Amino acid sequence: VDTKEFLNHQVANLNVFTVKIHQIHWYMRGHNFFTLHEKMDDLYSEFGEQMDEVAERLLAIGGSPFSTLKEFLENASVEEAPYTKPKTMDQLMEDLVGTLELLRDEYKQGIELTDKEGDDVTNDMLIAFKASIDKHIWMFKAFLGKAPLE
Amino acid sequence: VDTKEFLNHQVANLNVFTVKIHQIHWYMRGHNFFTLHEKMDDLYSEFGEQMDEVAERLLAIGGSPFSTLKEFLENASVEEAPYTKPKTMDQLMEDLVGTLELLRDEYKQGIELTDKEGDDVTNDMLIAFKASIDKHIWMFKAFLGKAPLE
Amino acid sequence: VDTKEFLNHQVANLNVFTVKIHQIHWYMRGHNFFTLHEKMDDLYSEFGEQMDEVAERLLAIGGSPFSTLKEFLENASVEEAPYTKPKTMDQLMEDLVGTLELLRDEYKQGIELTDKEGDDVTNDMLIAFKASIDKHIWMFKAFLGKAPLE
Amino acid sequence: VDTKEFLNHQVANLNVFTVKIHQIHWYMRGHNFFTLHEKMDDLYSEFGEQMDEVAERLLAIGGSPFSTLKEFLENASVEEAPYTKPKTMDQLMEDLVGTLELLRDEYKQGIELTDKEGDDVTNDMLIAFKASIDKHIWMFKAFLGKAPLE
Amino acid sequence: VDTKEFLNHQVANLNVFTVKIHQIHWYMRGHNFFTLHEKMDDLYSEFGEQMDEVAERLLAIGGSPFSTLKEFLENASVEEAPYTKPKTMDQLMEDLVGTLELLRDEYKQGIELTDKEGDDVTNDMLIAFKASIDKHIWMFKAFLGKAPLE
Amino acid sequence: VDTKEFLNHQVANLNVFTVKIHQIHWYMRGHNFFTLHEKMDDLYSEFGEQMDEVAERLLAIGGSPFSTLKEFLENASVEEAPYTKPKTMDQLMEDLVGTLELLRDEYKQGIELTDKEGDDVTNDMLIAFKASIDKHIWMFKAFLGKAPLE
Amino acid sequence: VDTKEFLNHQVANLNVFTVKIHQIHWYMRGHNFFTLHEKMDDLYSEFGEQMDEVAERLLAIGGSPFSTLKEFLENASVEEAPYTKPKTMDQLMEDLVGTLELLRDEYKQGIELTDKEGDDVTNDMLIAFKASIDKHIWMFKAFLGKAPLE
Amino acid sequence: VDTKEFLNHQVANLNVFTVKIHQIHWYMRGHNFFTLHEKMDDLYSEFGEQMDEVAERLLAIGGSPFSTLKEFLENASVEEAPYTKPKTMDQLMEDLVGTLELLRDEYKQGIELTDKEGDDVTNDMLIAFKASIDKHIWMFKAFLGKAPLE
Amino acid sequence: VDTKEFLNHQVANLNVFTVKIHQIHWYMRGHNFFTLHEKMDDLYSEFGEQMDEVAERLLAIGGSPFSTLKEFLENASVEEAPYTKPKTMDQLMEDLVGTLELLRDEYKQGIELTDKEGDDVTNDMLIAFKASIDKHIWMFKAFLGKAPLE
Amino acid sequence: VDTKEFLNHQVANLNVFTVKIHQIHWYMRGHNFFTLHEKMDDLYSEFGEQMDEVAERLLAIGGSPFSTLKEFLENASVEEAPYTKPKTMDQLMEDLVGTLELLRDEYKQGIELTDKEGDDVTNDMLIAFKASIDKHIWMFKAFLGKAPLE
Amino acid sequence: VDTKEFLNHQVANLNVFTVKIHQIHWYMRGHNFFTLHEKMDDLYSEFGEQMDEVAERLLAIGGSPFSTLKEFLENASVEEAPYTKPKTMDQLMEDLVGTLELLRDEYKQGIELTDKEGDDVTNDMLIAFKASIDKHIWMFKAFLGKAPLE
Amino acid sequence: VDTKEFLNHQVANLNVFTVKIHQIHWYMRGHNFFTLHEKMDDLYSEFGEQMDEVAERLLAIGGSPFSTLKEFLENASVEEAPYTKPKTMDQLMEDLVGTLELLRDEYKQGIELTDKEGDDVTNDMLIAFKASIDKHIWMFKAFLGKAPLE
Numbered sequence A, B, C, D, E, F, G, H, I, J, K, L: 001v002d003t004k005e006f007l008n009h010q011v012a013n014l015n016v017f018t019v020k021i022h023q024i025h026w027y028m029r030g031h032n033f034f035t036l037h038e039k040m041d042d043l044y045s046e047f048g049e050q051m052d053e054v055a056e057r058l059l060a061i062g063g064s065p066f067s068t069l070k071e072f073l074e075n076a077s078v079e080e081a082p083y084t085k086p087k088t089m090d091q092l093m094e095d096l097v098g099t100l101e102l103l104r105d106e107y108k109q110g111i112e113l114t115d116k117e118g119d120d121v122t123n124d125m126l127i128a129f130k131a132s133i134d135k136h137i138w139m140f141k142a143f144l145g146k147a148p149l150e
């Protein structure tokens, strides 16, 4: 792939992720409800901004962002699933953390690609998002009792 | 129908509308770009909050909100379409207004349904979101040079 | 009358009331000057906002608000009179209170009217305005040494 | 039986509830201490404001609120009890929720009453308080690992 | 004439202008709706403060402001007209600017008169209001495509 | 007694006092209504804070605060009484002041006791609350036309 | 006089006035205590700033402000007197008003003198302080039941 | 002496100190102008508040604060002198610090006294103001190149 | 050229661009006046800050920024021209966009250069500014009805 | 000359002054660096606003402001010079003050000119700007150890 | 010992405590991660402030605070240990609580120490920190499921 | 070495630098006391945040930060020394700058290292810290009268 394609792919991913954050936020139950319920609100807003920025950066480089659920569904690498069976807090966090891991890894690809193609601006955006993802990964893993790269 | 079904249907609608708002805002062009670009950010946040509140009111009455793009696409009455052909700001606003008119009319049904079933709380929520939609409809129509209900 | 006419009649009353608030505010004298001087500023802003909201709700339901002193003068049920003879703080308060009671009473009609006509949004607006007027009526009557409905 | 009586009964209830929230707040222990400790502070202020509003709405419709612990004790339907045995976070939350459910249910009666009696303003206040109680009920039940209408 | 008469004449003018601002604000339609709708709100507040100031300055020099729509209508030099025939945005702004021009010019007379009279305080007030009017006039004319003194 | 007993006795007093403050706030009438009505809101919050702090200081030194209206009623030295007869603003303030003087005097004992006993921290708290009470006592007496120490 | 001398005379006056404001602020008693007590705090700050500004303006035009109580006492035209026999709220306000009047009249002289001397800057300062004093004079008079120039 | 006398004595000193601070503030020159000019504004406000607090504490304990420059001059231990000769920033600071040392030492007496007298509240006030003075003394000394107790 | 030279060249450009932004800001006319007038204010401040940061980064790497209009005029690559003829909002916008495009392109060189030189800090500054210019370029093009890369 | 010409001349002056403030800000060294570095940031913003205001006042009276560095250079009376040989803090401040003195003096002219011409508004602007310049002149002079008019 | 020695010993302790707070903050894991992670940030800041205040109070009484890790390590009574083995949230909290009890107990000594020495200021300092420590000890113990005094 | 090692080494350096900043802050004396005293508080906060970020970054890449003074002392390259003899402000600043220079140079290494290994996130962090260090280096050097790279 090329930058435009990489970027649009993230537009799709980010839209799926965001809905996933909402699912966790609405369905969670357990002693950590209060704290994690608010934390999801924070994630939602943060990833919603990554999303608009990625989309806007694409537009700025002459691209055209996907902009319908159908397109997002067709393009995303992030997986989603309806909430049927109830799920443990940890189960939900594990799904959150997994998606973060996916985004971290894809961003890594975009980062190197962008660097090789000499799109310095997109490169730096991706880096900054990664930085954050990494910190979240460390935090959600500690919540789950695990080491970050564990 | 029933309140729970009504509300869930709106969670689906709201998620489609919200992406539609982003589409407009990303793709718009013309002399009204700056002002309308920002207006869409406002709409996005507002509808996004209506969405969270409808979902949370459903949860509170014992329901289970849809929570994946697939479910939203499967259940929404709001229509969406990929942005292929360039459209006019007015064309874009006309799409927005149409969707607002759809929501208005559906809420009106929810308003009576919820009334008929005696759920005073859900009833008042819908009324307050309706009040806002009506004001937006007046403003967007004025933007387009039209009377609100014309 | 119908919703549109009721609302426009209130646009007229609200514009008269607002000027009346300024009158008291400018002409008042007595030991309570400071406090009441400030309270009127607050009433003025609140009533001015009800007024804009009533007019915008009208506009939203397809109406056309009166918008000239002459029309307000011609349609208001609220009475006004030039300040000639000096008047006491209590006399001023009594005028204020009476106007409040008129608004209350008229709002109550609009409330029945809109309930019967099914305009849930306007119904709620008026109810919220009434809620406030009732509270002011209690407070100004208490200032005057009276019971609210007494 | 009547709105005034209904309202005053809630002034009593609200006073008992508020002290119960402090009890929880003071005596809780457990891993959820920090979070729930602060959440109680928020409940305390919120119910304290409901209380002042109900009492002020009462005064405004010509009533006279109870205003001594003795009166509150004599009229409350909300139950209280000295903290002797050390209870569980969950036990404390279960008392809190139980009380919320009681308020919910009684407000529902008041809604209905006020509705039959024509007091639109009091009707709307109660509805809004209900909306909030319902949300809390959803949240505290999630905390306890239960569904709201559990 | 005299300062007192001048000032009171402005209280009348200011009140008619303020209502005229609301008319434009309520009835405007066209692509500039968003922006101008908000700009009128700003004008409304500004002129409403000039109004209270003028009236309070009059009161301070021992005068008695007019304080009824009737008085305002009887003394205003500013003209008003019911909105019957739907007007262009430009037509509305042209009415605004014309009124601004009228206030400018009358203030100029009050500055002279006040000057001659030796009421330094009133003189400075009027100057400061004129400074603002002049800036508006430049802005609204630019909006209309014209030079300020054009 | 002992610090712990002293402290819990204040929790009881503080709870009665706070309800008394609401009584005054609700039932007051007269020309000083607006000002005193808000002053009471301030007293309510302040004393409400002294109360949580005394209780928490108790908890911190190993004590167990009373936490039910029944307990408060059984232990308070502050007196309360249903509002039956209409009373004077001065009468109300005189009740307020009398209660402040009681608290002042009891804290004085606590301040003494507490120092006997070596509890520096509790000593300092009480001193700071006293400082405040003393100031209120000066102001309310001035309001009443009296010197502070009567 | 001469601008420098005039300004330094006001540094003196302003210092006396400011302490007078504290006197009233400290010794007042009566039903208007809360309100006037706070108003005096407001006056104190304002006049304290006029003071600093006058002194700094003098410094800026090459002068040297008085800067000791002794110099203030020796130069002030504003009169002060120890509080021995108690006074009424009205008596205190009357003293306040009288001093305001004195400052108004002296500023008027400085306004002329500063004008005669071409010190446009000092001229404008004085006018702005005069505007405020005039307003205060109207308000305190209204508090006293009098017309401003009465 | 007695607490009342001690307190009043400080009202006098504080008033002379405050003017002194202005003096330094107005007349200073040198490279440290901007910084010290602003620091004096801070000291002015701070001591001004100590002053009002001392006075009000006096009032609260049944005293009567001095409240005229004449009284202040008559009772102060703090020394003042017109600014004739050019002084140094260091000279000015040295005067400031000296005055600070005086207040510190006198508070120390007020402190022992209040202790002995059992006026816990006054005692604590003084200790807090002392704390602040001590810090200032440390900082101004450091500015001057000296150790604090140097 | 080298980092220092590149930076200094940008201090000159930035200074010319900033005055160009004020020219547009002052001279524009047309229906988009209010909105573009304000947007120019935003650009002015933003570019103004890039400028001070570029200058300060130069100073930090041991350079010496140009600091007179003469030097700016002598070194700038950005073109300026007196406003003689009345241009269209579009013409003005086009001039703005073309300058943005020039800055974009030159920053790109500096990015590369700063890179070849291994000045990581400067490299990142430039990238960040570029990111913003790119966004601006997208927005003003959209305003003009064009795609970003033309 | 005439108002327009005077104003435009100031546009040119103000533009040179603003760049000179940056030069000082950038090149300054010495113990006063932190404080003066920040003061210049304040001067830069202030004068930059005077500049925009002068320009907009010109536009408002029918003028056309210079708007290119070339025109600024061709019309300014304020002198600039490239920084080659280092210069003391004092030398820098001396340059600053000299320029302030020039603006002070020219404004004085404009002040009288505009008075001659009857442009009250422009006249008041200039006066207010002059008031600020005078105070700065006092402060910078004090910093340099001199009297304001020395 | 003496107050200066006592204080300095606290400087060392406070610095060790602070680092330990970070250790906990960085290494914690488990479901309470979010909440405790933030809580540690708060303690870090609070204790860091006590630290500077103790140091500055020492400097103010003529002392010389330790100011190097070496000194802190040499003087502290608080114990620290590298995080090797994996610890429980509870274990971590237990370590925190233990250190808090140590500080509490040492402050108690400093309280008596400064009291016999008659340093009222230092005495009050310590008291206020103690107050806070005691509250924290209650909270962390409840978190651990324990009563405060163990 | 490797990123982990590098980062941990900075954790150690940052903690030593932070304590050094407090030393300077506490011990400085001279005319610049006020300004630099505050500047160090700024540096202390800044560096304390760099420190927490570095540590969290480490943790996030799977590392384990040093977390005891002992470890810091053992690993830091930043030197520290007890304050025995009085030193000049300049001497203090020179120690500060030297440390800044050290961190700058070490970060440059980290920058290189982090890049060879391609840890883009850590690389950008270091770059951003460097940017700030460089600026501080330019400013403290100017303060010392030197050029940044000397």
Ligand SMILES: [Fe+3]
Binding pocket: A052, A056, B041
């Ligand atoms: Fe966006």
Ligand SMILES: [Fe+3]
Binding pocket: A025, A041, B052, B056
């Ligand atoms: Fe939510």
Ligand SMILES: [Fe+3]
Binding pocket: C052, C056, E025, E041
């Ligand atoms: Fe509006």
Ligand SMILES: [Fe+3]
Binding pocket: D052, D056, F025, F041
């Ligand atoms: Fe209330």
Ligand SMILES: [Fe+3]
Binding pocket: C025, C041, E052, E056
């Ligand atoms: Fe007013």
Ligand SMILES: [Fe+3]
Binding pocket: D025, D041, F052, F056
């Ligand atoms: Fe609490």
Ligand SMILES: [Fe+3]
Binding pocket: G052, G056, H025, H041
């Ligand atoms: Fe000052």
Ligand SMILES: [Fe+3]
Binding pocket: G025, G041, H052, H056
């Ligand atoms: Fe006071």
Ligand SMILES: [Fe+3]
Binding pocket: I052, I056, J025, J041
């Ligand atoms: Fe700068």
Ligand SMILES: [Fe+3]
Binding pocket: I025, I041, J052, J056
């Ligand atoms: Fe502008």
Ligand SMILES: [Fe+3]
Binding pocket: K052, K056, L025, L041
């Ligand atoms: Fe400090």
Ligand SMILES: [Fe+3]
Binding pocket: K025, K041, L052, L056
């Ligand atoms: Fe952290």
